[PDB]
């Protein structure tokens, strides 16, 4: 019982790429994915609605659940949605945290979709692609390449 068109407006290209892309592609990719995590919500698309590359990004949710922890993530995501948060920072620690930074952000971007949560309409976004690095892109290609390419 649901009266709602399955919206897409699938702007993302590498969403369903299925295979490994360029360094320059993981650049836009993070923008696409973090936005796609949102589209599954706002438009209420599908999580399965994508390609191979994206499935691994989903696992960065998990890596974050492992790292930051489901508890913290739960507290954190919700914090984001009231426009008041907290957070610590990592840098040269672990690739695990590198990935974790994406998924933790991904859980936040999705959660907002239903009503377009943020409360603060201004500065509702910012560091999404800048939350990771071209250097991370290389790691990303590599991680994916394990099954990708």
Backbone as a chain_set.jsonl record, in Angstrom:
{"seq": "XXXXXXXXXXXXXXXXXXXXXXXXXXXXXXXXXXXXXXXXXXXXXXXXXXXXXXXXXXXXXXXXXXXXXXXXXXXXXXXXXXXXXXXXXXXXXXXXXXXXXXXXXXXXXXXXXXXXXXXXXXXXXXXXXXXXXXXXXXXXXXXXXXXXX", "coords": {"N": [[0.846, -1.216, 0.0], [1.227, 1.705, -1.189], [1.31, 4.792, -2.612], [3.125, 6.181, -4.851], [5.29, 7.37, -7.274], [8.092, 5.693, -8.669], [10.739, 7.422, -8.483], [13.691, 8.577, -10.156], [15.671, 10.139, -11.717], [18.233, 9.653, -12.292], [21.042, 10.85, -12.435], [23.716, 10.268, -11.884], [26.413, 8.484, -13.318], [28.36, 6.515, -13.062], [27.142, 5.153, -11.217], [25.86, 2.727, -11.994], [27.922, 1.634, -13.252], [29.304, -0.768, -13.115], [31.821, -1.717, -13.551], [35.328, -1.001, -12.987], [36.472, 2.356, -12.852], [38.131, 5.337, -14.048], [40.705, 7.142, -12.216], [39.859, 9.738, -12.197], [37.255, 9.434, -12.155], [36.292, 8.512, -9.855], [36.294, 10.652, -8.567], [34.122, 12.305, -9.267], [32.431, 10.466, -8.623], [32.147, 10.081, -5.804], [30.588, 12.237, -5.271], [28.352, 11.625, -6.811], [27.59, 9.154, -5.543], [27.227, 9.72, -2.739], [25.15, 11.492, -3.166], [23.405, 9.743, -4.404], [22.861, 7.886, -2.391], [21.167, 9.512, -1.142], [19.144, 9.983, -2.992], [17.866, 7.463, -3.018], [16.289, 7.739, -0.943], [14.914, 10.345, -0.826], [13.657, 10.295, -3.373], [12.907, 7.898, -3.034], [14.139, 5.625, -4.262], [15.98, 2.75, -5.075], [18.266, 0.75, -3.225], [19.532, -1.309, -4.338], [19.412, -0.636, -6.766], [21.669, 0.033, -8.797], [25.106, -0.353, -9.815], [28.052, -2.459, -9.781], [30.258, -1.229, -8.626], [29.136, 0.559, -6.788], [28.114, -1.037, -4.762], [30.177, -1.68, -3.133], [30.834, 0.712, -1.938], [28.664, 0.813, -0.277], [29.47, -0.929, 1.604], [31.158, 0.552, 3.011], [29.709, 1.746, 4.765], [29.498, -0.106, 6.614], [32.053, -0.56, 7.395], [32.445, 1.753, 8.671], [30.483, 1.418, 10.631], [31.843, -0.582, 11.922], [34.098, 0.831, 12.694], [33.512, 3.531, 13.786], [31.145, 2.821, 14.93], [27.962, 1.386, 15.336], [26.282, 2.395, 17.29], [27.466, 4.941, 17.804], [27.3, 6.01, 15.267], [24.514, 6.014, 14.922], [23.872, 7.91, 16.917], [25.282, 10.028, 15.931], [24.316, 10.451, 13.239], [21.636, 11.209, 13.658], [22.204, 13.463, 15.228], [23.305, 15.152, 13.25], [20.9, 15.633, 11.889], [19.466, 17.372, 13.35], [20.905, 19.564, 13.106], [23.048, 19.948, 14.757], [26.02, 18.816, 15.902], [28.814, 16.615, 16.663], [32.232, 15.498, 16.491], [35.232, 13.592, 15.927], [38.536, 13.457, 14.401], [40.404, 11.685, 11.907], [43.435, 10.796, 10.099], [46.209, 9.927, 8.987], [45.843, 7.286, 9.717], [44.249, 4.622, 9.25], [43.292, 2.875, 6.285], [40.865, 1.738, 6.683], [39.524, 3.658, 8.162], [39.525, 5.617, 6.308], [37.709, 4.643, 4.353], [35.618, 4.424, 6.148], [34.928, 7.033, 6.625], [33.494, 7.753, 4.414], [31.155, 6.058, 4.441], [29.949, 6.715, 6.92], [29.258, 9.318, 6.388], [27.551, 8.75, 4.371], [25.393, 7.522, 5.516], [24.261, 9.6, 6.76], [23.575, 11.431, 4.696], [21.617, 9.941, 3.323], [19.57, 9.512, 5.253], [18.352, 11.966, 5.533], [16.785, 12.299, 3.277], [13.956, 11.71, 3.156], [12.208, 13.822, 4.222], [13.769, 15.803, 3.363], [15.781, 16.499, 5.351], [17.489, 18.665, 7.644], [16.972, 21.061, 8.672], [18.31, 23.551, 8.989], [18.314, 25.287, 6.177], [20.156, 26.643, 4.749], [23.573, 26.038, 4.144], [23.334, 23.262, 4.053], [24.852, 21.38, 3.045], [28.282, 20.582, 2.094], [31.328, 19.599, 2.703], [31.643, 16.96, 0.905], [32.672, 15.541, -1.428], [35.088, 16.527, -0.83], [35.637, 15.323, 1.458], [37.119, 13.21, 1.133], [40.009, 12.108, -0.788], [41.827, 12.566, -3.873], [43.879, 10.814, -3.595], [42.687, 8.921, -2.197], [40.971, 7.984, -3.935], [42.51, 6.412, -5.538], [42.995, 4.311, -3.836], [40.448, 3.446, -3.58], [39.706, 2.704, -6.232], [41.401, 0.566, -6.331], [40.603, -1.139, -4.216], [38.1, -1.804, -5.124], [38.769, -2.867, -7.581], [39.603, -5.353, -7.013], [37.354, -6.915, -7.402], [36.244, -5.571, -9.331], [36.877, -3.986, -12.554]], "CA": [[0.0, 0.0, 0.0], [2.064, 2.884, -1.334], [1.039, 5.561, -3.809], [4.293, 7.005, -5.107], [6.074, 7.03, -8.448], [9.485, 5.371, -8.42], [11.543, 8.472, -9.074], [15.085, 8.253, -10.372], [16.473, 11.264, -12.143], [19.56, 9.08, -12.202], [22.078, 11.708, -12.938], [24.923, 9.504, -11.762], [26.838, 7.718, -14.47], [29.12, 5.377, -12.576], [26.17, 4.469, -10.358], [25.629, 1.401, -12.526], [29.087, 1.412, -14.105], [29.507, -2.227, -13.041], [33.22, -1.971, -13.639], [36.205, -0.015, -12.389], [36.619, 3.515, -13.665], [39.345, 6.122, -13.933], [40.942, 7.949, -11.031], [39.087, 10.964, -12.362], [35.872, 9.036, -12.164], [35.975, 8.309, -8.452], [36.243, 12.036, -8.195], [32.73, 12.666, -9.39], [31.784, 9.305, -8.05], [31.787, 10.332, -4.422], [29.501, 13.192, -5.357], [27.239, 10.816, -7.289], [27.185, 8.153, -4.556], [26.687, 10.442, -1.586], [23.863, 12.003, -3.62], [22.585, 8.575, -4.705], [22.404, 7.461, -1.068], [20.111, 10.436, -0.807], [18.082, 9.709, -3.967], [17.149, 6.257, -2.603], [15.42, 8.192, 0.105], [14.071, 11.453, -1.325], [12.915, 9.777, -4.496], [12.68, 6.548, -2.588], [14.581, 4.703, -5.294], [16.406, 1.476, -4.522], [19.663, 0.58, -2.881], [20.015, -2.333, -5.235], [19.374, 0.098, -8.02], [22.991, 0.509, -9.098], [26.041, -1.301, -10.371], [28.961, -3.19, -8.911], [31.096, -0.242, -7.963], [28.377, 1.17, -5.71], [27.86, -2.006, -3.706], [31.324, -1.622, -2.24], [30.611, 1.926, -1.178], [27.696, 0.426, 0.745], [30.231, -1.647, 2.601], [31.864, 1.577, 3.762], [28.751, 1.985, 5.822], [29.792, -1.197, 7.528], [33.393, -0.273, 7.847], [32.18, 2.828, 9.615], [29.818, 0.732, 11.726], [32.908, -1.262, 12.622], [35.044, 1.788, 13.226], [32.844, 4.505, 14.645], [30.224, 2.011, 15.667], [26.556, 1.592, 15.019], [25.833, 3.276, 18.364], [27.938, 6.283, 17.551], [26.715, 6.408, 14.002], [23.133, 6.309, 15.264], [23.855, 9.16, 17.658], [25.86, 11.0, 15.047], [23.403, 10.742, 12.138], [20.555, 11.955, 14.296], [22.765, 14.766, 15.574], [23.313, 15.856, 11.963], [19.599, 15.968, 11.365], [18.99, 18.498, 14.145], [21.803, 20.666, 12.812], [23.969, 20.092, 15.882], [26.79, 17.586, 15.914], [30.128, 16.488, 17.251], [33.014, 14.509, 15.76], [36.683, 13.591, 15.98], [39.113, 13.351, 13.067], [41.533, 10.817, 11.631], [44.186, 11.261, 8.941], [47.156, 8.926, 8.515], [45.621, 6.132, 10.576], [43.948, 3.381, 8.542], [42.39, 2.8, 5.142], [39.587, 1.397, 7.278], [38.91, 4.914, 8.545], [39.342, 6.298, 5.035], [36.422, 4.16, 3.892], [34.648, 4.695, 7.201], [34.552, 8.418, 6.498], [32.493, 7.803, 3.366], [29.913, 5.437, 4.875], [29.364, 7.512, 7.994], [28.665, 10.45, 5.704], [26.534, 8.208, 3.494], [24.247, 7.227, 6.369], [23.707, 10.906, 7.062], [22.971, 11.981, 3.488], [20.416, 9.174, 3.01], [18.564, 9.682, 6.3], [17.709, 13.256, 5.332], [16.026, 12.35, 2.037], [12.498, 11.591, 3.273], [11.616, 15.155, 4.301], [14.899, 16.7, 3.119], [16.135, 16.922, 6.697], [18.637, 19.541, 7.824], [16.397, 22.154, 9.461], [19.004, 24.682, 8.418], [18.245, 25.172, 4.724], [21.435, 27.174, 4.31], [24.686, 25.192, 4.582], [22.8, 21.917, 4.219], [25.89, 20.525, 2.491], [29.599, 21.178, 2.124], [32.412, 18.658, 2.445], [31.197, 15.635, 0.5], [33.789, 15.051, -2.218], [36.271, 17.029, -0.138], [35.767, 14.505, 2.651], [38.099, 12.221, 0.71], [41.069, 12.686, -1.596], [42.306, 11.889, -5.077], [44.74, 9.755, -3.113], [41.76, 7.943, -1.667], [40.406, 7.493, -5.179], [43.397, 5.357, -5.947], [42.725, 3.216, -2.929], [39.113, 3.064, -3.903], [39.827, 1.941, -7.466], [42.14, -0.628, -6.003], [39.718, -1.974, -3.422], [37.056, -2.243, -6.014], [39.419, -3.636, -8.651], [39.591, -6.718, -6.505], [36.283, -7.598, -8.089], [36.018, -4.638, -10.411], [37.555, -4.137, -13.843]], "C": [[0.867, 1.246, 0.0], [1.796, 3.565, -2.669], [2.158, 6.571, -4.039], [5.045, 6.487, -6.322], [7.502, 6.69, -8.032], [10.372, 6.353, -9.174], [12.982, 8.007, -9.203], [15.882, 9.512, -10.56], [17.944, 10.919, -11.991], [20.571, 9.818, -13.045], [23.428, 10.998, -12.956], [25.154, 8.583, -12.947], [27.469, 6.408, -14.032], [28.31, 4.607, -11.549], [26.036, 2.984, -10.716], [26.78, 0.976, -13.425], [29.415, -0.069, -14.24], [30.991, -2.597, -13.042], [34.028, -0.79, -13.121], [36.462, 1.137, -13.364], [38.002, 4.14, -13.516], [39.498, 6.701, -12.532], [39.995, 9.138, -11.028], [37.597, 10.694, -12.232], [35.371, 8.836, -10.745], [35.888, 9.669, -7.789], [34.801, 12.495, -8.143], [31.901, 11.669, -8.635], [31.282, 9.547, -6.644], [30.611, 11.293, -4.348], [28.234, 12.458, -5.774], [26.698, 9.899, -6.194], [26.524, 8.79, -3.356], [25.323, 11.068, -1.921], [22.885, 10.854, -3.9], [22.033, 7.95, -3.434], [21.2, 8.285, -0.655], [18.901, 10.152, -1.688], [17.241, 8.482, -3.607], [16.091, 6.606, -1.574], [14.404, 9.215, -0.372], [13.101, 10.963, -2.385], [12.385, 8.399, -4.15], [12.926, 5.562, -3.72], [14.87, 3.339, -4.674], [17.881, 1.524, -4.212], [20.326, -0.394, -3.846], [20.09, -1.756, -6.625], [20.715, 0.797, -8.268], [23.827, -0.62, -9.686], [26.987, -1.832, -9.325], [29.735, -2.263, -8.008], [30.423, 0.274, -6.685], [28.193, 0.258, -4.509], [28.968, -1.948, -2.671], [31.282, -0.385, -1.369], [29.649, 1.667, -0.025], [28.405, -0.224, 1.915], [31.049, -0.689, 3.459], [30.971, 2.099, 4.874], [29.14, 1.104, 6.988], [31.117, -0.983, 8.2], [33.365, 0.841, 8.884], [31.453, 2.303, 10.845], [30.827, -0.034, 12.572], [33.777, -0.265, 13.365], [34.398, 2.689, 14.26], [31.81, 3.808, 15.513], [28.806, 2.389, 15.386], [25.948, 2.58, 16.016], [26.198, 4.716, 18.084], [27.331, 6.827, 16.287], [25.258, 6.828, 14.189], [23.017, 7.676, 15.934], [24.309, 10.315, 16.776], [24.874, 11.427, 13.951], [22.256, 11.633, 12.59], [20.994, 13.353, 14.724], [22.77, 15.678, 14.348], [21.945, 16.402, 11.615], [18.959, 17.115, 12.148], [19.906, 19.704, 13.972], [22.765, 20.96, 13.95], [24.717, 18.793, 16.108], [28.08, 17.707, 16.706], [30.906, 15.501, 16.402], [34.514, 14.702, 15.964], [37.229, 13.353, 14.577], [40.288, 12.379, 13.027], [42.244, 11.307, 10.374], [45.062, 10.153, 8.363], [47.061, 7.643, 9.336], [45.451, 4.848, 9.765], [43.044, 3.627, 7.352], [40.966, 2.488, 5.594], [38.81, 2.659, 7.651], [38.644, 5.745, 7.302], [37.991, 5.938, 4.449], [35.312, 4.533, 4.86], [34.092, 6.108, 7.085], [33.463, 8.593, 5.439], [31.155, 7.271, 3.88], [29.196, 6.193, 5.969], [28.648, 8.723, 7.404], [27.486, 9.989, 4.856], [25.246, 7.95, 4.265], [23.512, 8.516, 6.715], [22.945, 11.47, 5.866], [21.67, 11.258, 3.12], [19.275, 9.528, 3.959], [17.719, 10.936, 6.071], [16.678, 13.248, 4.198], [14.521, 12.472, 2.223], [11.805, 12.955, 3.302], [12.623, 16.232, 3.897], [15.329, 17.345, 4.434], [17.415, 17.739, 6.697], [18.245, 20.649, 8.784], [16.992, 23.492, 9.035], [19.09, 24.496, 6.907], [19.541, 25.668, 4.095], [22.562, 26.37, 4.947], [24.19, 23.79, 4.919], [23.797, 20.887, 3.681], [27.232, 21.239, 2.565], [30.676, 20.197, 1.718], [31.869, 17.262, 2.174], [32.288, 14.939, -0.31], [35.104, 15.41, -1.545], [36.517, 16.27, 1.16], [36.767, 13.376, 2.399], [39.038, 12.86, -0.306], [41.279, 11.906, -2.869], [43.197, 10.704, -4.722], [43.89, 8.592, -2.642], [41.112, 7.229, -2.842], [41.202, 6.306, -5.675], [43.155, 4.116, -5.127], [41.398, 2.584, -3.285], [39.082, 2.214, -5.157], [40.393, 0.571, -7.166], [41.285, -1.626, -5.241], [38.68, -2.621, -4.293], [37.605, -3.203, -7.043], [39.569, -5.096, -8.3], [38.506, -7.533, -7.176], [35.886, -6.834, -9.346], [37.05, -4.796, -11.517], [36.934, -5.282, -14.632]], "O": [[1.202, 1.781, 1.057], [2.028, 2.984, -3.729], [2.138, 7.674, -3.492], [5.394, 5.309, -6.392], [8.058, 7.33, -7.139], [10.71, 6.146, -10.339], [13.436, 7.146, -8.45], [16.663, 9.912, -9.697], [18.774, 11.75, -11.622], [20.892, 9.457, -14.177], [24.187, 11.11, -13.918], [24.226, 7.991, -13.497], [27.156, 5.339, -14.556], [28.726, 3.552, -11.07], [26.091, 2.112, -9.849], [26.639, 0.076, -14.253], [29.754, -0.556, -15.319], [31.364, -3.676, -12.582], [33.485, 0.281, -12.851], [36.649, 0.913, -14.56], [38.913, 3.55, -12.936], [38.54, 6.745, -11.759], [39.413, 9.494, -10.003], [36.785, 11.619, -12.203], [34.18, 8.972, -10.468], [35.477, 9.815, -6.638], [34.321, 13.001, -7.129], [30.838, 11.971, -8.092], [30.129, 9.254, -6.327], [29.75, 11.177, -3.475], [27.175, 12.639, -5.174], [25.493, 9.869, -5.945], [25.399, 8.445, -2.995], [24.45, 11.16, -1.058], [21.684, 10.982, -3.662], [20.877, 7.531, -3.394], [20.33, 7.821, 0.082], [17.772, 10.085, -1.202], [16.037, 8.462, -3.861], [15.129, 5.866, -1.366], [13.196, 8.984, -0.327], [11.893, 11.187, -2.305], [11.554, 7.821, -4.85], [12.053, 4.776, -4.088], [14.099, 2.84, -3.853], [18.647, 2.244, -4.853], [21.521, -0.305, -4.125], [20.731, -2.298, -7.526], [20.874, 1.986, -7.99], [23.318, -1.694, -10.007], [26.756, -1.677, -8.125], [29.852, -2.478, -6.801], [31.062, 0.406, -5.641], [28.124, 0.724, -3.372], [28.73, -2.142, -1.479], [31.653, -0.43, -0.196], [29.797, 2.227, 1.061], [27.993, -0.087, 3.067], [31.57, -1.072, 4.507], [31.414, 2.793, 5.789], [29.117, 1.5, 8.153], [31.281, -1.194, 9.402], [34.149, 0.863, 9.832], [31.765, 2.693, 11.97], [30.683, -0.125, 13.791], [34.147, -0.484, 14.519], [34.701, 2.616, 15.451], [31.62, 4.156, 16.678], [28.478, 3.564, 15.219], [25.199, 3.481, 15.638], [25.346, 5.604, 18.122], [26.896, 7.978, 16.241], [24.827, 7.863, 13.68], [22.173, 8.493, 15.565], [23.791, 11.428, 16.865], [24.628, 12.618, 13.76], [21.957, 12.662, 11.984], [20.235, 14.313, 14.594], [22.304, 16.817, 14.398], [21.833, 17.515, 11.1], [18.022, 17.753, 11.668], [19.712, 20.739, 14.611], [23.243, 22.085, 14.093], [24.116, 17.78, 16.466], [28.385, 18.731, 17.316], [30.301, 14.732, 15.656], [34.996, 15.819, 16.148], [36.46, 13.074, 13.657], [41.059, 12.267, 13.98], [41.708, 12.151, 9.656], [44.701, 9.52, 7.371], [48.07, 6.995, 9.616], [46.399, 4.078, 9.611], [42.149, 4.471, 7.395], [39.992, 2.915, 4.973], [37.593, 2.722, 7.479], [37.665, 6.488, 7.24], [37.211, 6.82, 4.089], [34.212, 4.909, 4.454], [32.929, 6.354, 7.406], [32.613, 9.476, 5.555], [30.134, 7.951, 3.771], [27.97, 6.304, 5.952], [27.571, 9.105, 7.861], [26.535, 10.742, 4.645], [24.148, 8.133, 3.74], [22.301, 8.52, 6.935], [21.812, 11.93, 6.003], [20.723, 11.893, 2.655], [18.157, 9.808, 3.527], [16.527, 10.961, 6.377], [15.792, 14.102, 4.166], [13.873, 13.253, 1.525], [10.913, 13.213, 2.494], [12.368, 17.424, 4.065], [15.252, 18.562, 4.607], [18.304, 17.538, 5.869], [19.048, 21.116, 9.592], [16.265, 24.445, 8.755], [19.842, 23.654, 6.418], [19.967, 25.18, 3.048], [22.518, 26.056, 6.136], [24.574, 23.207, 5.933], [23.609, 19.681, 3.84], [27.312, 22.37, 3.044], [30.914, 19.984, 0.53], [31.66, 16.478, 3.099], [32.771, 13.875, 0.075], [36.101, 14.698, -1.67], [37.483, 16.539, 1.874], [37.198, 12.686, 3.322], [38.875, 14.032, -0.647], [40.95, 10.722, -2.943], [43.26, 9.718, -5.456], [44.309, 7.435, -2.68], [40.756, 6.052, -2.768], [40.647, 5.324, -6.167], [43.115, 3.005, -5.654], [41.243, 1.363, -3.291], [38.503, 1.128, -5.16], [39.925, -0.446, -7.679], [41.246, -2.81, -5.576], [38.419, -3.821, -4.21], [36.991, -4.227, -7.345], [39.65, -5.961, -9.172], [38.708, -8.707, -7.487], [35.287, -7.373, -10.276], [37.964, -5.617, -11.433], [37.368, -5.569, -15.747]]}, "num_chains": 1, "name": "protein.A"}
